[PDB]
Design a protein around this motif. Structure first.
Motif, short mmCIF file in Angstrom:
data_model
loop_
_atom_site.label_atom_id
_atom_site.label_comp_id
_atom_site.label_asym_id
_atom_site.label_seq_id
_atom_site.Cartn_x
_atom_site.Cartn_y
_atom_site.Cartn_z
N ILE A 33 -10.48 -5.75 -4.32
CA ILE A 33 -9.99 -6.28 -5.58
C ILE A 33 -8.82 -7.22 -5.25
CG2 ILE A 33 -9.46 -5.57 -7.99
CD1 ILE A 33 -10.92 -3.05 -7.51
N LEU A 34 -8.65 -7.53 -3.97
CA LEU A 34 -8.04 -8.81 -3.64
C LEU A 34 -9.08 -9.93 -3.74
CD1 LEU A 34 -5.65 -10.49 -2.62
CD2 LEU A 34 -6.39 -9.93 -0.31
N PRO B 37 0.13 -5.60 -8.13
CA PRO B 37 0.25 -6.07 -6.74
C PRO B 37 -0.41 -7.41 -6.51
CG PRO B 37 -0.42 -3.80 -6.77
CD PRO B 37 -0.60 -4.31 -8.14
N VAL B 38 -1.53 -7.67 -7.17
CA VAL B 38 -2.21 -8.92 -6.87
C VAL B 38 -1.53 -10.07 -7.58
CG1 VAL B 38 -4.32 -7.67 -6.40
CG2 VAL B 38 -3.98 -8.67 -8.66
N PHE B 39 -0.85 -9.79 -8.69
CA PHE B 39 -0.01 -10.81 -9.29
C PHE B 39 1.18 -11.09 -8.41
CE2 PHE B 39 -1.54 -9.61 -13.79
CZ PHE B 39 -2.72 -10.28 -13.55
N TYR C 43 -8.54 3.74 -3.52
CA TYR C 43 -7.73 2.70 -4.12
C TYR C 43 -7.28 1.67 -3.09
CZ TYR C 43 -4.06 0.38 -6.65
OH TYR C 43 -3.26 -0.57 -7.23
N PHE D 96 -6.95 13.62 -4.60
CA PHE D 96 -5.90 12.64 -4.79
C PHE D 96 -5.85 11.65 -3.63
CE2 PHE D 96 -1.49 11.43 -3.90
CZ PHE D 96 -1.21 10.71 -5.05
N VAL E 71 -7.72 -2.25 -3.09
CA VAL E 71 -6.75 -3.31 -2.84
C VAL E 71 -7.39 -4.45 -2.07
CG1 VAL E 71 -4.57 -3.85 -1.68
CG2 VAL E 71 -4.78 -1.80 -3.05
N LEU F 133 0.82 -1.21 0.00
CA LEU F 133 0.00 0.00 0.00
C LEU F 133 0.85 1.26 0.00
CD1 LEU F 133 -2.89 -1.05 2.39
CD2 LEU F 133 -3.01 -0.54 -0.05
N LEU G 53 1.74 5.47 -6.67
CA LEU G 53 0.45 5.81 -7.27
C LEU G 53 0.51 7.17 -7.94
CD1 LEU G 53 -2.85 5.13 -5.32
CD2 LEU G 53 -2.63 7.32 -6.43
N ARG H 192 2.15 -15.07 -2.29
CA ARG H 192 1.21 -15.65 -1.35
C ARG H 192 0.57 -16.94 -1.84
NH1 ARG H 192 -2.95 -11.41 0.90
NH2 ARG H 192 -3.54 -13.31 2.05
N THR I 201 -8.96 -10.38 -6.90
CA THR I 201 -7.96 -11.21 -7.54
C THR I 201 -8.46 -12.63 -7.61
OG1 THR I 201 -5.60 -11.50 -7.85
CG2 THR I 201 -6.38 -12.29 -5.80
N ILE J 244 -2.57 -1.20 -12.50
CA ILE J 244 -2.49 -0.68 -11.15
C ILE J 244 -3.11 -1.65 -10.15
CG2 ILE J 244 -2.21 1.77 -11.54
CD1 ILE J 244 -5.27 1.90 -11.93
N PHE J 245 -4.19 -2.31 -10.54
CA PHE J 245 -4.75 -3.36 -9.72
C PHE J 245 -3.94 -4.64 -9.86
CE2 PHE J 245 -7.98 -0.49 -11.41
CZ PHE J 245 -8.49 0.04 -10.24
N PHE J 246 -3.49 -4.95 -11.06
CA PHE J 246 -3.06 -6.31 -11.37
C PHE J 246 -1.67 -6.63 -10.87
CE2 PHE J 246 -6.52 -5.63 -14.20
CZ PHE J 246 -7.16 -6.86 -14.20
N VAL K 272 2.45 1.56 -3.28
CA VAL K 272 1.51 1.83 -4.36
C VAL K 272 0.88 3.20 -4.21
CG1 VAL K 272 -0.72 1.00 -3.46
CG2 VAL K 272 -0.07 0.53 -5.88
N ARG K 273 1.06 3.85 -3.06
CA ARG K 273 0.77 5.28 -2.93
C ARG K 273 1.93 6.09 -3.49
NH1 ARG K 273 2.49 8.21 1.12
NH2 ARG K 273 3.14 6.23 2.06
N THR L 210 -6.80 7.82 -3.35
CA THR L 210 -5.77 6.96 -2.79
C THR L 210 -6.38 5.96 -1.82
OG1 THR L 210 -4.19 8.78 -2.99
CG2 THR L 210 -3.61 6.94 -1.55
#
Lengths: 50, 50, 87, 200
Positions: D184-185, C73-75, D177, D170, D181, C15, C22, C81, D188, C69-71, C18-19, D174
């Motif tokens: 959208i985990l 970190p989850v990849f 977002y 912003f 996370v 996080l 970001l 994990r 995932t 941006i989503f993908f 990614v900020r 953030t």
């Protein structure tokens, strides 16, 4: 000279006919590269100019 | 070791200027043609006889 | 940078990364698409290449920058994990 | 590119540093093909206008990462760019290494069209290589010297109006977002399988 007449300067006059001296361009950029390289060796602003 | 040349920042200026006049010499040196010759060599021997 | 220099759990370091990451994604994204405004407004003069390829890399931005941006970190957290070590 | 460069962080000082750093890079491009003697050419010129797109956004990733690292904790920028050049001496050799890896195939083509690919190849060889090099040495010096020692942990409490208000947008996006996370985990899970359907 009448019309329809040309001419030529050659020999070593061909060499100087190309250029007598592009040297002062090279003294110019030589002064440049001396100025900046000494600006690294001095590592100082305009202290090299001395 | 980069910071050593942060400690001479004017040195990095000098490197940038060497780029400026090596590149300026290049752009005042490099010839111009839009298509850097692509086609394979093709000698065309030809003749003519009435 | 935030794996073992910062030995935290993956998600909160993700996080912060990614900020701190970001704001680059936005500034690079808008920066480049304003970079390719002339490529897409162009009529004539390589117009297929700057128009088509400018729109191609523009779609590279919007289907990359605001996609993954989503993908990313989850990849990362499914590679780790699901497939880190036991320790 | 310059108006883009001034545009973002609203500073008439800081954002002006990398700007003059920018064109030196591309003219060094010519110096690289001065090593090659490759004449200025519309194919090559177009590959280098795409490539100058590439080194200007390489320029803003390095200088925005620098501006960030010196920006979030506000110490005098020496140690800031020391850590910064730690992680992006690693990342600069990263992007040079993998980017070189993505267009060595462009170097190793056959065919005459493939030699045009060689021209675009050497174009972005120049762009990539010297861009990474001037980011390595010149950029931390320029950021290190002529910037201001700013306050520590400063978010811009005096910057107000539409601008800092947009920075509140912003942080809104953030934390929005951050919720993306977590949720959208869970996506995932469902955007794992959605990733498979979009990739096919």
């Amino acid at each position: 000279l009448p019309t329809g007449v040309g001419y030529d300067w050659t020999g070593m006059s061909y060499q100087e006919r190309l250029s007598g001296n592009q040297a002062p361009s090279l003294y110019a950029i030589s002064l440049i590269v001396v100025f900046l390289c000494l600006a690294a060796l001095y590592e100082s602003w305009s202290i090299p100019f001395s | 070791m980069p910071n050593f040349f942060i400690d001479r920042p004017i040195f990095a200026w000098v490197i940038a200027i060497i780029i400026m006049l090596a590149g300026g010499l290049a752009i005042l040196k490099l010839p111009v043609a839009q298509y850097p010759t692509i086609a394979p060599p093709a000698v065309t021997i030809s003749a003519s006889y009435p | 940078d935030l794996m073992d220099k910062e030995g935290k759990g993956l998600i909160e370091a993700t996080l912060d990364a990614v900020r701190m990451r970001l704001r680059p994604i936005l500034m690079t994204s808008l920066a480049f698409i304003l970079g390719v405004m002339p490529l897409v407004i162009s009529t004539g003069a390589g117009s297929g290449a700057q128009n088509a390829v400018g729109t191609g890399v523009m779609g590279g931005m919007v289907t990359a920058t605001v996609l993954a941006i989503f993908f990313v970190p989850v990849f990362f957290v499914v590679v780790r994990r699901r497939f880190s070590r036991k320790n | 590119v310059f108006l883009v460069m001034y545009l973002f962080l609203q500073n008439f000082r800081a954002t002006l540093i990398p700007t003059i750093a920018v064109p030196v890079v591309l003219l060094g491009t010519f110096a690289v093909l001065a090593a090659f003697g490759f004449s200025i050419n519309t194919l090559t010129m177009f590959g280098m206008v795409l490539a100058i797109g590439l080194l200007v956004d390489d320029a803003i990733v390095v200088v925005e990462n620098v501006e960030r690292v010196m920006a979030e904790e506000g110490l005098p920028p020496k140690e800031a760019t020391r850590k910064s050049m730690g992680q992006i001496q690693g990342a600069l050799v990263g992007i040079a290494m993998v980017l070189s890896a993505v267009f060595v195939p462009m170097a190793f083509f056959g065919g005459s069209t493939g030699a045009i690919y060689r021209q675009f190849s050497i174009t972005i060889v120049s762009a990539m290589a010297l861009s990474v090099l001037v980011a390595l040495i010149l950029t931390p010096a320029l950021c290190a010297t002529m910037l201001k020692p700013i306050a520590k942990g400063d978010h811009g409490e005096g910057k107000k109006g539409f601008f800092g208000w947009f920075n509140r947008m912003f942080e809104k996006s953030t934390h929005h977002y951050t919720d993306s996370v977590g949720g959208i985990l869970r996506s995932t899970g469902r955007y794992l399988v959605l990733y498979l359907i979009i990739v096919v």
